PDB file of C-alpha atoms in Angstrom:
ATOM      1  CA  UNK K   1     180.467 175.559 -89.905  1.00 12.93           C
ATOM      2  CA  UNK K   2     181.410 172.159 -88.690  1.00 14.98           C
ATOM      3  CA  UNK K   3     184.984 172.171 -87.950  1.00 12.62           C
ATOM      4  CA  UNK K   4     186.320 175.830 -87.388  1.00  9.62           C
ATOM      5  CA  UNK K   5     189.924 177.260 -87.714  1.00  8.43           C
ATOM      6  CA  UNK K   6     190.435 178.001 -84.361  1.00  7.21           C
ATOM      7  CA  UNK K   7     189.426 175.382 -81.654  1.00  9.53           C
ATOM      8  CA  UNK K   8     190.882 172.831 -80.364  1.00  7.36           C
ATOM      9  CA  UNK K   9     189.857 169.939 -77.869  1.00  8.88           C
ATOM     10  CA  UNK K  10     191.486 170.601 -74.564  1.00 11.80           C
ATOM     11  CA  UNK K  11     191.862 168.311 -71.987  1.00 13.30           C
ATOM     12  CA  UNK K  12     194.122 167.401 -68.517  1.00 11.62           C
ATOM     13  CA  UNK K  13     197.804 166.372 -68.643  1.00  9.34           C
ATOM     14  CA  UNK K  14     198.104 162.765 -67.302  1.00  6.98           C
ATOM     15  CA  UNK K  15     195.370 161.038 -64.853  1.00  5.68           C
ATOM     16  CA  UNK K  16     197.270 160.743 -61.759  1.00  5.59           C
ATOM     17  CA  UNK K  17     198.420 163.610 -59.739  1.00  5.16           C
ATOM     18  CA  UNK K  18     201.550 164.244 -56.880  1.00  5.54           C
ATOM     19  CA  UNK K  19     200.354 167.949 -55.642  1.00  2.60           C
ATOM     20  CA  UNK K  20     196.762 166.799 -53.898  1.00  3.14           C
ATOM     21  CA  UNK K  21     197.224 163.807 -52.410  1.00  2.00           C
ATOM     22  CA  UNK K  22     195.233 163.928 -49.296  1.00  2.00           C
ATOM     23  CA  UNK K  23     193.693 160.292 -48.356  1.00  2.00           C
ATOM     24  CA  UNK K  24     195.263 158.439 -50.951  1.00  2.00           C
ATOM     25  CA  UNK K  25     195.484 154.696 -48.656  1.00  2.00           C
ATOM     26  CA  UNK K  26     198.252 152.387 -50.521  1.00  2.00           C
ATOM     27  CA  UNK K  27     198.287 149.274 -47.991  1.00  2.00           C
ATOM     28  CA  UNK K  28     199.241 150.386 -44.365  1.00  2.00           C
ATOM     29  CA  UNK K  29     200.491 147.411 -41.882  1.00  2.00           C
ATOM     30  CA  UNK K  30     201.114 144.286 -43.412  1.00  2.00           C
ATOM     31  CA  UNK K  31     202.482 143.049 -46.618  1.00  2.00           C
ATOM     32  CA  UNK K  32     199.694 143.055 -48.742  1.00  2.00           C
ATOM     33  CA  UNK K  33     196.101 145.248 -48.879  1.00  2.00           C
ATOM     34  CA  UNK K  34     192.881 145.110 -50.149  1.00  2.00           C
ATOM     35  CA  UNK K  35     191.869 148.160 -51.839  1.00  2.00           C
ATOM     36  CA  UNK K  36     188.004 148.925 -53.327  1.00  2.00           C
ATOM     37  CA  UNK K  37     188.190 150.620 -56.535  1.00  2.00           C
ATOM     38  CA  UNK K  38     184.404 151.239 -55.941  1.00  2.00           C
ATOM     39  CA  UNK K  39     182.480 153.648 -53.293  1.00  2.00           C
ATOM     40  CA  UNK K  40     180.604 151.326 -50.871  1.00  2.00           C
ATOM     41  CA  UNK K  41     179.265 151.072 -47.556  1.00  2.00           C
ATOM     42  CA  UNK K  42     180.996 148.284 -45.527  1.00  2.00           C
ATOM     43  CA  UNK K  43     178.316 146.641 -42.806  1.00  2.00           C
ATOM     44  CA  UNK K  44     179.977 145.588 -39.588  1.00  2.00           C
ATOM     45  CA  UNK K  45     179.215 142.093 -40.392  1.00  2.00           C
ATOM     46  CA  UNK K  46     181.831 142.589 -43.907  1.00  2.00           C
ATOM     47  CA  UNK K  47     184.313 143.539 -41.206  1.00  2.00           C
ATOM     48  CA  UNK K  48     184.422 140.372 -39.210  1.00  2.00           C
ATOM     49  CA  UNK K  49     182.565 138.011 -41.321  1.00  2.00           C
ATOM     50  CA  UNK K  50     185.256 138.626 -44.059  1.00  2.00           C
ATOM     51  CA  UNK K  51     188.262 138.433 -41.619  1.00  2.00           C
ATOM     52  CA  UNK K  52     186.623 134.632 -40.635  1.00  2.00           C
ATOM     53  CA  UNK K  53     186.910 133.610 -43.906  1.00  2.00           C
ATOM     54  CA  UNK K  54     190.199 134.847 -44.512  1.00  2.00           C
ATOM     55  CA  UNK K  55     191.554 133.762 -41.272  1.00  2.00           C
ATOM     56  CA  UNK K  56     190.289 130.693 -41.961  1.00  2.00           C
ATOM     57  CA  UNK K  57     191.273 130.591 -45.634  1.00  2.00           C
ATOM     58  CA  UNK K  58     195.307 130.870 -44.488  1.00  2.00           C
ATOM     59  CA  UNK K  59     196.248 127.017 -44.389  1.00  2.00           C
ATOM     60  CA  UNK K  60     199.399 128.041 -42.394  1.00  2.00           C
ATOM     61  CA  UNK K  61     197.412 130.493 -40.239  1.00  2.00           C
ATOM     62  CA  UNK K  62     197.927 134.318 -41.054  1.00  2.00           C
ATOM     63  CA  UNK K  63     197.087 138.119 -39.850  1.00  2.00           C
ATOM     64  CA  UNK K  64     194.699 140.414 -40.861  1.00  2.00           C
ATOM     65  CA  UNK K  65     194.889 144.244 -39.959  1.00  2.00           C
ATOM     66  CA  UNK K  66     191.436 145.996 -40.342  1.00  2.00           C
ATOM     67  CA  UNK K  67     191.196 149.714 -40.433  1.00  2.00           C
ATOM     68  CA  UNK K  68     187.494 150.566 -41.648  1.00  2.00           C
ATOM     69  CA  UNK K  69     184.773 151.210 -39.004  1.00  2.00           C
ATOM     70  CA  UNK K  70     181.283 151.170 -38.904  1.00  2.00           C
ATOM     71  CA  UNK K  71     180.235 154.985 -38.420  1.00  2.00           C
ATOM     72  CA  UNK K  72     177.911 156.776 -40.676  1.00  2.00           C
ATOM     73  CA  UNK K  73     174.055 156.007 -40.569  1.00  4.61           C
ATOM     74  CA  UNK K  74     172.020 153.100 -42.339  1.00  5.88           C
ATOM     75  CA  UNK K  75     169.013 154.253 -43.600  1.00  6.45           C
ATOM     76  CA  UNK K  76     166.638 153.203 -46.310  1.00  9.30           C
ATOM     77  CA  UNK K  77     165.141 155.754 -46.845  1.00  7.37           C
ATOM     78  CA  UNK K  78     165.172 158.447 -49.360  1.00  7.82           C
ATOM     79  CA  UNK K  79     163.779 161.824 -48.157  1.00  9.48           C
ATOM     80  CA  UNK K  80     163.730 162.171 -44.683  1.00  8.23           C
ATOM     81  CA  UNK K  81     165.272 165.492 -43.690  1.00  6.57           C
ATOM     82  CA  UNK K  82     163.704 167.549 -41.153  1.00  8.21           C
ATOM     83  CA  UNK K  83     160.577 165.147 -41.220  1.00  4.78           C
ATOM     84  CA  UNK K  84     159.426 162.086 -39.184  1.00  7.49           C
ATOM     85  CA  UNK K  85     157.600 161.548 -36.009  1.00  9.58           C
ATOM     86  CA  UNK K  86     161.185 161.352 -33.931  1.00 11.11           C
ATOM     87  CA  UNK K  87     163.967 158.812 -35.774  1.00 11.36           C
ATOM     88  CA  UNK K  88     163.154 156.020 -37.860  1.00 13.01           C
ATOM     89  CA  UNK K  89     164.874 152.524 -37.034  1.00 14.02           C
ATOM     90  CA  UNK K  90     168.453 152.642 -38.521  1.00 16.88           C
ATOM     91  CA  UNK K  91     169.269 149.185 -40.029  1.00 16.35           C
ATOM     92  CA  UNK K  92     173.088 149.023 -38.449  1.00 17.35           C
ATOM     93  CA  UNK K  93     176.392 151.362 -39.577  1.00 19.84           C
ATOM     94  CA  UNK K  94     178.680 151.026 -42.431  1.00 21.25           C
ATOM     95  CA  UNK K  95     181.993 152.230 -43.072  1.00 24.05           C
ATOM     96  CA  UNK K  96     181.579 154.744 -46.248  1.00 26.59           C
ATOM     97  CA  UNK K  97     184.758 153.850 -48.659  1.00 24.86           C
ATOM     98  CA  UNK K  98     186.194 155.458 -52.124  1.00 25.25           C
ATOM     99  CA  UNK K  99     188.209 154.465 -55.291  1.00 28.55           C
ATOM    100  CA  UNK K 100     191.829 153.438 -53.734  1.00 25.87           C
ATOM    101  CA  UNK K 101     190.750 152.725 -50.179  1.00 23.85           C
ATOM    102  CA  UNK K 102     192.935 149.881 -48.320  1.00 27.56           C
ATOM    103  CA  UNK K 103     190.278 147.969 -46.260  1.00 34.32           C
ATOM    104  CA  UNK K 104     192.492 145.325 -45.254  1.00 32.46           C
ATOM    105  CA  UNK K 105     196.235 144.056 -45.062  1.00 29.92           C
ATOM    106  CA  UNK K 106     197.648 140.957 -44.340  1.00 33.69           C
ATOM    107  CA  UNK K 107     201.282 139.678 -44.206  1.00 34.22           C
ATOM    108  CA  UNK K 108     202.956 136.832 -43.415  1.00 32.68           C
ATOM    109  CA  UNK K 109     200.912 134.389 -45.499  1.00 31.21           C
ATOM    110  CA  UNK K 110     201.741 133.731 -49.087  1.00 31.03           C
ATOM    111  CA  UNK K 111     201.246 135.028 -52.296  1.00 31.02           C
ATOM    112  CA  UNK K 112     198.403 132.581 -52.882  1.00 31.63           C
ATOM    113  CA  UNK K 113     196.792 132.907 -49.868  1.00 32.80           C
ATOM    114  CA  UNK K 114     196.963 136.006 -49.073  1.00 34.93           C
ATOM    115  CA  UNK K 115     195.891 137.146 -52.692  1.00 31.05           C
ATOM    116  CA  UNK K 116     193.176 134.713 -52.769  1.00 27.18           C
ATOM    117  CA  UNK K 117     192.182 135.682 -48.702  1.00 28.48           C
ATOM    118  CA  UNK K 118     192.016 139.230 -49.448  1.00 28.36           C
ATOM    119  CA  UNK K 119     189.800 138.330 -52.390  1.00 27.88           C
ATOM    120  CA  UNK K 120     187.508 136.937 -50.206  1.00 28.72           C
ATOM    121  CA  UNK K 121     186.807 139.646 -48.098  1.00 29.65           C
ATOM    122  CA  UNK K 122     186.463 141.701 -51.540  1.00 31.10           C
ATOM    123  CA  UNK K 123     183.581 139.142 -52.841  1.00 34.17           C
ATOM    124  CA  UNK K 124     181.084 140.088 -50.323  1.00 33.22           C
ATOM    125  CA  UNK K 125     181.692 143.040 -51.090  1.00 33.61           C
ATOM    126  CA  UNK K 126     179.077 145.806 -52.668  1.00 36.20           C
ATOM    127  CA  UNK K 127     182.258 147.063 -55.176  1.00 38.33           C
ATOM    128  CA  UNK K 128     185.454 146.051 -56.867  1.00 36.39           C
ATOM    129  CA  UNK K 129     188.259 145.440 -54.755  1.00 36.94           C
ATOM    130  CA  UNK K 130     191.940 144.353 -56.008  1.00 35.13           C
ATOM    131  CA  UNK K 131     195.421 142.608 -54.072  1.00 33.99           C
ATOM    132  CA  UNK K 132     198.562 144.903 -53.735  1.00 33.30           C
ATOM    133  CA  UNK K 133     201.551 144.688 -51.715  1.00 38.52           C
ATOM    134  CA  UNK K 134     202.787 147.191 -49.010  1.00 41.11           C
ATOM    135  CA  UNK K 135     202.712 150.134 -51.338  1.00 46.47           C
ATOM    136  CA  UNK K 136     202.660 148.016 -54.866  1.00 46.54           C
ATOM    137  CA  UNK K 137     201.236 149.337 -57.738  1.00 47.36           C
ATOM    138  CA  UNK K 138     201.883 148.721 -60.934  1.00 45.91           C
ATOM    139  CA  UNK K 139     200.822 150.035 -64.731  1.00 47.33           C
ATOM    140  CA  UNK K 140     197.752 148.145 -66.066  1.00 48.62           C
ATOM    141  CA  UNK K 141     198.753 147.392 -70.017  1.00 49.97           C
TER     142      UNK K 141
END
């Protein structure tokens, strides 16, 4: 028996999905918004250190609107649940982020600079992150 007269490989109907859509961050506040396709945990440092560049990067000035926050614990440690000799030192916060998460938005600036700006932030980044305008996504062929 290698290919029976009766099954059939099943799968979903189409990736994306209207019903549960609880989180799902387009842009928010500006024009444009940097999105990680990637789970990561953004240090404080990413915050502002990114916004310098990319205030910086804006030739004819420009905006940023943050909306991540440092929060959830930074340890480096593996196991360490219910065990130590009172808290071990935690090396700083990060902001925990998923697949489709707008990190940051600017508007006013163009195109160019605000693509390229929001890139920035993106490359110091621990995951893959991706320009798109106030709610602007389009197929990828």
């Amino acid at each position: 028996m290698l290919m029976p007269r009766r099954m059939k490989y099943r799968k979903q109907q189409r990736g994306r999905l209207k019903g549960a859509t609880k989180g799902g961050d387009y842009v928010a506040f500006g024009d444009y918004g940097l999105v990680a396709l990637e789970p990561a945990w953004i240090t404080a440092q990413q915050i502002e250190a990114a916004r310098v560049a990319m205030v910086r990067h804006f030739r004819r000035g420009g905006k940023i609107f943050i909306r991540i926050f440092p929060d959830k614990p930074y340890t480096k440690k593996p196991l360490e649940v219910r065990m130590g000799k009172g808290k071990g030192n935690v090396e700083g916060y990060v902001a925990v982020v998923k697949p489709g998460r707008v990190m940051f938005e600017v508007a006013g600036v163009t195109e160019e600079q605000a693509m390229e700006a929001l890139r920035i932030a993106g490359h110091k980044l621990p995951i893959k992150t991706k320009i798109v305008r106030r709610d602007a996504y389009d197929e990828a062929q």
